[PDB]
Design a binder for this molecule. Structure first.
Ligand code: HEM
Ligand code: HEM
Ligand SMILES: Cc1cc(N)nc2cc(-c3cncc(CN)c3)ccc12
Ligand SMILES: Cc1cc(N)nc2cc(-c3cncc(CN)c3)ccc12
Ligand SMILES: C[C@H](O)[C@H](O)[C@H]1CNc2nc(N)[nH]c(=O)c2N1
Ligand SMILES: C[C@H](O)[C@H](O)[C@H]1CNc2nc(N)[nH]c(=O)c2N1
Ligand SMILES: [Zn+2]
Lengths: 409, 411
């Protein structure tokens, strides 16, 4: 129960003690591994032990476990819970909580940067208009003229479940998707239902292939509100190839800022249902997933056509060939435009370093092999031959149902 | 209890009930997933339950459950166990066993072919020489002039664990690897330790970058003996590229017959410690892993150099580019030589179809996502988007420690 993990490319062996501090469950049992499954209103008695575990962590990290300051805080929170049926995080705890939620995100390959996170406390927010303002400042700060900076903005915590703050967008910036008359799909197919929700709520769509969606912001449980992100804040990159001049005529571009906004940040038992966070892209997320997935932009066949590869048989590996050039082009475009981006070799190497460090300083590092290994060229990245243990630590980012299935108007 | 798996590219959802018939463990708990860990004497006390459940399985498959034949076979195995501390499988039972072992192999993307397995019963073998002869015949039959056929050869089951049959090779056909004094490796780095053993056991090593290794064969718990596979039986393919003429000048070849010989076949409680089995290659096993793994032939740089790629910055994706062309060349070479091979696109597609079929007629299909997804171009194959449940059924193929780490030498 002091588990070893081995790297089969380097014979490096690491001992994991940190999994011992695991709270939540995995959905796996002794009889079935569910490690590839995408997606497997608290009470007063539920909250205090949750609050205690977190404060114990916190005061331990500032080298003050068991101190007067620690005890007094524990007492203070304990009083507040009995009385208010919840409690409030101190600024310093809020920052620790956010940074550590990222650190514990076993599906995230970029966690080597985990401690350099910019936390924007928006707990004083009361309206969607106010949310729009916090969100615009997030986007501007994080983008930073192409020199991306990681950030999270944290809106008021859940209270009774009827006063929830939600960003209805899955990411702050995404391209729209419209289903065409001939059955096809213009723009981004993944966003079709949401794109039609905006329209079905008053959005006037330009119906282009790359229309930046509007923000749908829900404050204190009210009906959500539409806002257009000032285009001057949406940093976009035209996609060209360093060797293929025709590449530009495909007319592709992507946004520079990956900013996920549909997850729930849980700290000390407290639930932050609106907490959009952002960093910078790994090249493959755009090139492999966004562009080439069949259920997305699916440009492979079109690109392969321009290269004049042999698309008659699958054993020509024309898909693979095209896949590579596309990802070469995405990296090349971003880099030329001085927008931050990381290639899948650099990032997986970074993560391997990060692993070493966490075993060396923390005694372990939760990691989800199925998500850490890039969607192309898997086995020539170091992570592929790295055994990983996946377990659930807290604070954490968790999934939550899409608002339109829950909300009442 | 039901369980549903979803394909996120097709929105197809399937319901698994087969996982309920799962006996063995995964290595996972509620608090930890170990799905990415590579590796997660048996008396009569536990043998007859294992026997009964297998026989129940078998006679269900042939639609004779509870029949006279079923009952009497149960009684027969019962008395033979209490009398002899073990039992023998009938031919039918052994054939069913090998087939279903393959079928239950959750890390195998090629199980669409599981029903068509040629089962060679070598349970009468008593010596290493007899082993050599059975294996030659396997290799000849399986290779079939390049038109490959699935086969498995089953040698005698373990008894007291002191008289094991083992094939000390991890694969029947595999290239030697020699650690040079300067630190470099000639041949296959994967096979260096096994090569050294062979050399120690008296193998005159040619010391080239593609020397077929000698068979090292152990019968009845005796010390292993060296045999050379006759070259005319070892089908190989020169690797060339369809556009790049300099590729052939890299001097690469590879064998056609993937024949894994180091695993353990468990059927109805019995353990077959030596049971070589072979199919045919998915292209990526050779082009991605054998050639481009840093701990193998690792030709990426010499290929990249010849392509004149920008190798000074890894964001040029020159590694990625070199990898595709090598896999292109492996596929081209095999196809041109009419030696059976399958590309990772065809194979994963086939497996998805198989998998769906298995949910419809069997109620599930145990699958290890981590191993099924191909080591290149993962998300543009359909298995990447396929949720998969991993559980262990019997009959099954299991791993065993390397024989040289556990063998009592006689002298
Ligand atoms: C700074 C550069 C970063 C990079 C390169 C990066 C990379 C990635 C990648 C490739 C994934 C896989 C998800 C997918 O393929 O769609 C992922 C998931 C994730 N990232 Fe990171 N990330 C970065 C920053 C951050 C930050 C700042 C946070 C939080 C504050 C974060 C939290 C997460 C979480 C929670 C997941 C998985 C969510 C889930 O359960 O689905 N990441 N990341
Ligand atoms: C006929 C074409 C076949 C193909 C293309 C195929 C393909 C594969 C591949 C690529 C792997 C993963 C190995 C790796 O990448 O390192 C695998 C695993 C496996 N295969 Fe197949 N296979 C085939 C036939 C067979 C046969 C005939 C058997 C046995 C009778 C078999 C039993 C297994 C088992 C037990 C594993 C698990 C390996 C392990 O646990 O280490 N397969 N297969
Ligand atoms: C901060 C961040 C940066 C980045 N480059 N990719 C992310 C990807 C995700 C992510 C996790 N699960 C599902 C999705 C589907 N859009 C995305 C979340 C955050 C990310
Ligand atoms: C029947 C069969 C066919 C095939 N094409 N590849 C296999 C690959 C393996 C396999 C699994 N893990 C590790 C290795 C390394 N030798 C091989 C086992 C059986 C295979
Ligand atoms: C079913 C499967 O788990 C699903 O396709 C996962 C696999 N691994 C992934 N890995 C990353 N990084 N991102 C993803 O969206 C997924 N999707
Ligand atoms: C550590 C990790 O489990 C290991 O590298 C696995 C991952 N997936 C694999 N998948 C296949 N097909 N073959 C392999 O050898 C491996 N190796
Ligand atoms: Zn698991």
């Amino acid at each position: 129960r002091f588990l070893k993990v081995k790297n089969w490319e380097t014979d490096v062996v690491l001992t994991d003690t940190l999994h011992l501090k695991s709270t939540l469950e995995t959905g796996c049992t002794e009889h079935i591994c569910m490690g590839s499954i995408m997606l497997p209103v608290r009470t007063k008695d539920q909250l205090f032990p949750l609050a205690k575990e977190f404060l114990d962590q916190y005061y331990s990290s500032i080298k003050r476990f068991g101190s007067k300051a620690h005890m007094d805080r524990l007492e203070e929170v304990n009083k507040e819970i009995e009385s208010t049926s919840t409690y409030q995080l101190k600024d310093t705890e809020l920052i620790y909580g956010a940074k550590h939620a990222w650190r514990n995100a076993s599906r995230c390959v970029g966690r080597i940067q985990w401690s350099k996170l910019q936390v924007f406390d928006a707990r004083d927010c009361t309206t969607a208009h106010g949310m729009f303002n916090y969100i615009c400042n997030h986007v501007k700060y994080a983008t930073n003229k192409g020199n991306l900076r990681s950030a999270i903005t944290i809106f008021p915590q859940r209270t009774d479940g009827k006063h929830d703050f939600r960003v209805w967008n899955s990411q702050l910036i995404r391209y729209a998707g419209y289903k065409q008359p001939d059955g096809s799909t213009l723009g981004d197919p993944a966003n079709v239902q949401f794109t039609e929700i905006c329209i079905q709520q008053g959005w006037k769509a330009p119906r282009g292939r790359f229309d930046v969606l509007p923000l749908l912001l829900q404050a204190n449980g009210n009906d959500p509100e539409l806002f257009q992100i000032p285009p001057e804040l949406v940093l976009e990159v035209p996609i060209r190839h360093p060797k293929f001049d025709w590449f530009k005529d495909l007319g592709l571009k992507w946004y520079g800022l990956p900013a996920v906004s549909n997850m729930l940040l849980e700290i000390g038992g407290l639930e932050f249902s609106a907490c959009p966070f952002s960093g910078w892209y790994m090249g493959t997320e755009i090139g492999v997933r966004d562009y080439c997935d069949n259920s997305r932009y699916n440009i492979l066949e079109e690109v392969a056509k321009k290269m004049d590869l042999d698309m008659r048989k699958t054993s020509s590996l024309w898909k693979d060939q095209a896949l590579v050039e596309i990802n070469i082009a995405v990296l090349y475009s971003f880099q030329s435009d001085k927008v931050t981006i990381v290639d899948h070799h650099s990032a997986t190497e970074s993560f391997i370093k990060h692993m070493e460090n966490e075993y060396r300083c923390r005694g372990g590092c939760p990691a989800d092999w199925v998500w850490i290994v890039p969607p192309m060229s898997g086995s020539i990245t170091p992570v592929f031959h790295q055994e990983m243990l996946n377990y659930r630590l807290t604070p954490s980012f968790e999934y939550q149902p899409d608002p339109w299935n829950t909300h009442v108007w």
